[PDB]
């Protein structure tokens, strides 16, 4: 719930003796965390508001040229000079042009010529600096329990919902303990400075469109720029990047401005991430946190509750939620009050063994009214199986066929673990890690390989990875040596890093 209709939901289970688990809250996906006798909480990073960014160089992209003039001197009579060359608002260029008796001169040669042109930028883009000390990650939480289908996307009111709570993770106060009344208190222990490398990113602003421009890309743009500490009429360093001084075959020096570089840099922002801005705060839609989930105090609400006596009803016939799990919504018809749903899976009916596990730990009817819509989620085994809900003769079954296999679930998890590893790199070794000599040894051998890849190849685009990935493929099928694994481990580390996208 809040994660159940998400195509990128992750299932985290198995803990450090039941104490904590270390998760990586990716920004587009979702994390469902389940324990042995603790409620299944659904965790989702929703925004990242970079607050109060200070501006850096602001490049011009659509320039203009105002009242221009030019001056020329005869051959060996010095270099030419306008008095408006002593103005920093005018772009300017000297040249040597043909100067003879027809030009009013008196000596045939290459007479000098200078041409001034008032640079006045009309539209400019602006890069702002992102500090890691201003990240504000909102983490939405939603436990499985007294909730129905209209509480997945619905967020109007959660300070008094008692099943849902947000926590903000600033760097100064990264770890919060969210109040889930009755459900205990989920202790988050986040790591906000190691998100999406925000000490090397800027925040572009072009025509009310904002991007996560990288640091190195922004200081290589050939556009006229002034400093961020420039308030009045700007200075515009590097004015000669948008004016074009073409001479002719005679005295003429024609200056023309290049056009609007707005769309000419939208095609140069070919890897940047679009962002938005609700004032001075840059709301992101991408990144990741790194959260440790202290679940010592989060307890299971409603173990004391008696079972549901009678008369469930299926509303919204169950569906498979892209992973094998089964969203089941029921309508309890009875006034037993805060009671407990007797739901399970079953292969047969002569035994009613629970054959598959249950995602929503302790499904509970809470409303004491007559008809209470209530939602579950189950994890069936692979094959024909029945969703037995209710106790007695008025129990409700549903035939369910979970199409799949265990080796088709393990291969689905290796592909799931590889796309997590090609995005996070070193951090993806700490997604379900309880802390070991293998989840921290294999990370340290990957943090070495991750640093000798970010520097070695590290700048190859999508096409240029496959272009040298194919080359190292051929160097892995030939030139037999001990360095034939160093040509094929740099094959999957290059063609994959690029096809898992």
């Amino acid at each position: 719930i809040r994660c159940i209709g998400v195509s990128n939901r992750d299932f985290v289970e198995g803990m450090s003796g039941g104490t904590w688990v270390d998760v990586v809250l990716e920004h587009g996906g979702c994390v469902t965390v389940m324990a042995q006798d603790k409620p299944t909480v659904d965790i989702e990073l929703v925004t990242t508001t970079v607050s109060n960014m200070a501006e850096v160089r602001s490049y011009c992209y659509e320039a203009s040229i105002s009242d221009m003039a030019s001056d020329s001197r005869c051959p060996t009579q010095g270099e030419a000079y306008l008095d408006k060359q002593s103005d920093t608002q005018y772009v300017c260029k000297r040249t040597l042009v043909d100067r003879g008796w027809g030009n009013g001169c008196g000596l045939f040669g290459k007479g000098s010529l200078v041409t001034c042109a008032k640079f006045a930028c009309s539209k400019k883009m602006t890069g702002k600096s992102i500090q890691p000390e201003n990240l504000e990650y909102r983490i939405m939480l939603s436990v499985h329990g007294s909730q129905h289908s209209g509480m997945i996307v619905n967020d109007t009111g959660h300070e008094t919902d008692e099943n849902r709570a947000k926590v903000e993770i600033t760097p100064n106060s990264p770890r919060a303990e969210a109040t889930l009344g009755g459900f205990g208190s989920l202790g988050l222990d986040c790591e906000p400075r190691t998100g999406l490398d925000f000490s090397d990113l800027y925040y572009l602003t072009m025509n009310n469109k904002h991007w996560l421009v990288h640091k190195e890309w922004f200081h290589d743009i050939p556009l006229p720029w002034h400093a961020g500490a420039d308030t009045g009429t700007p200075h515009w360093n590097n004015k000669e990047a948008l004016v074009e001084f073409k001479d002719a075959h005679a005295k003429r020096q024609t200056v023309v401005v290049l056009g609007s570089q707005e769309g000419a840099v939208h095609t140069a922002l070919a890897g940047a991430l679009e962002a938005e801005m609700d004032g001075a705060k840059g709301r992101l839609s991408s990144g990741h946190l790194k959260c440790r989930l202290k679940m010592d105090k989060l307890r299971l609400k409603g173990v004391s509750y008696s079972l549901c006596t009678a008369a469930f009803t299926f509303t919204k016939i169950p569906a498979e939620t892209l992973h094998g799990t089964v969203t089941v919504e029921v309508q309890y018809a009875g006034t037993d009050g805060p009671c407990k749903v007797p739901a399970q899976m079953a292969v047969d009916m002569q035994t009613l063994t629970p054959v598959g596990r249950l995602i929503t730990a302790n499904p509970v009817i809470t409303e004491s009214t007559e008809n209470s819509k209530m939602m579950l989620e189950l994890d069936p085994p692979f094959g024909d199986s029945y969703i037995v809900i209710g106790v007695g003769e008025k129990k409700i079954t549903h035939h369910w066929h979970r199409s799949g296999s265990t080796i088709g679930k393990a291969f689905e998890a290796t592909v799931r673990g590889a796309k997590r590893m090609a995005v996070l790199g070193d951090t993806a070794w700490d997604f379900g890690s309880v802390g070991g000599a293998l989840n921290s040894l294999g990370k340290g051998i990957h943090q070495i390989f991750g640093a000798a890849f970010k520097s070695l190849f590290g700048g190859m685009s999508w096409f240029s990875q496959i272009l040298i990935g194919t080359l190292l493929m051929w160097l892995g099928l030939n030139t037999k040596n001990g360095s034939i694994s160093l040509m094929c481990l740099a094959l999957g580390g290059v063609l994959i890093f690029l096809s898992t996208a």
Partner: protein
């Protein structure tokens, strides 16, 4: 601007889709197939420099590829 740097060298790898991702799979592949369609006679010149260099029949194919990739986007 003339030499705007490409941000695809430093693309942020963040779970979500970047600014252009849909146009980046056929960005540099349409450009190399548009150039070689315009003047297709360069393949006679590319397979005459590549055949004259290396001389290993697989080293001569990689030079036929790398000349035919440096020639559209000049660099």
């Amino acid at each position: 601007a003339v030499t705007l740097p490409s941000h695809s060298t430093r693309k942020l790898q963040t779970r979500s889709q970047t600014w252009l991702e849909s146009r980046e799979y056929t960005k540099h592949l349409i450009r190399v197939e548009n150039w070689i369609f315009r003047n297709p006679g360069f393949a006679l010149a590319a397979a005459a420099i590549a055949w004259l260099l290396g001389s290993s029949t697989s080293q001569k194919v990689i030079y036929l590829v790398m000349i035919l990739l440096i020639a559209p986007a000049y660099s």
